[PDB]
Paper text:
[name] is the primary component of the cytoplasmic inclusions in ~97% of ALS and ~45% of FTLD (that is, FTLD-[name]) cases. We show that [name] filaments contain a β-sheet-rich helical amyloid core that is fully buried by the flanking structured domains of the protein.
Based on the abundance of peptides with respect to the spectral counts containing at least two repeats, we identified that the 82 amino acids containing core peptide (CP) regions between 279 and 360 likely formed the amyloid core of [name]. Under the same in vitro aggregation conditions used for the FL [name], CP formed ThT-positive β-sheet-rich fibrils of different morphologies. Consistent with the negative-stain EM data, the cryo-EM analysis showed polymorphic CP fibrils exhibiting variable length as well as a tendency to undergo lateral associations. A combination of three-dimensional (3D) classification and structural refinement revealed two populations of ~70-Å CP fibrils. The density of the second protofilament was mostly disordered, with disconnected loops, and was not used for model building. One cross-sectional layer of the atomic model revealed a novel ‘H-fold’ conformation of the CP filaments that consists of six linked β-strands with rigid loops and turns. Despite their similar sequence, the recombinant peptide 279–360 exhibited a very distinct fold with major differences in secondary structures (β-strands, turns and loops), in comparison with the core amyloid structure of brain-derived [name] filaments or [name] fibrils produced in vitro from the entire CTD domain or shorter CTD-derived peptide fragments.
Author numbering:
A (entry chain B), B (entry chain A), C (entry chain C), D (entry chain D), E (entry chain E): 281 to 351
Write the structure that this text describes.
């Protein structure tokens, strides 16, 4: 319906195999035989994130605003 | 319906195998034979996150606002 | 209905196997044979989180506000 | 419907195999026999993220705003 | 419908094999026998991200705004 978000993320309907395998949004995982130094950032400063919708990996949202801020 | 969010996250309807396997949003896991240094940040400063909707991994939301702030 | 959020998180309807396996939003886990240094932060400062909806991993929410703050 | 977002992410409907395999948006994972130094950033400064929708990996969103800020 | 975004991400409907394999938007992963130094950035300064929609890897969004800011 209105403001509708329907994310399937079907991935492995049948199946999933393999020594290293992964479905969906992935920011690492599975098997690691060494260093894993993964630091993602999404920071806000001053008049940040106004009237926005931050998604780094696959998001789903619906939004509605009418509002005047001040500082 | 209105402001509707329906996330399936179907992933492995049939099945999931493998030495290293993972479904959905993943920020690490499974098997680790070494260092795991993973620090994600999402920080807010000053007039931050106004009229927004932060999702780093796959979110679902519905929102409605009319409001004037001050500082 | 109105302001509706219906997250399936179906994951392994059939089954899930494997030496390292995990479904849903994952921020680590399973098997760890070494260091695990994972520090995610989501901090608010000053006029932070106004009129927002923070989700880092896959959220579900519905919201409605009309309100003028001051400081 | 209106403001509709329907992400299939079908991936492996039949199946997925192989020594190193992965479906969906991927920011690393699977198998790692060495260093893994992956730091993605998406930062906001000053009048940042106004009237926008940040997605680095495949997002889904719907948005509606009418609001005059100040600083 | 209106403001509609329907990303299939069909990927391997039949199957996916091979020693190194990956579907969807990929920013690394699979198998790594050495150094992995991958740092992508998307930063905002001054009057940044106004009236925009940042996607580095394949996004999906719908947007509607009428709002005059100031500083």
């Amino acid at each position: 319906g209105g403001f509708g978000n329907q994310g399937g993320f079907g991935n492995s309907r049948g199946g999933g195999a393999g020594l290293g395998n992964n479905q969906g949004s992935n920011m690492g995982g599975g098997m690691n035989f060494g260093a894993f130094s993964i630091n993602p950032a999404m920071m806000a400063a001053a008049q940040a994130a106004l009237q926005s919708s931050w998604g780094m990996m696959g998001m789903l949202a619906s939004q509605q605003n009418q509002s005047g801020p001040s500082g």
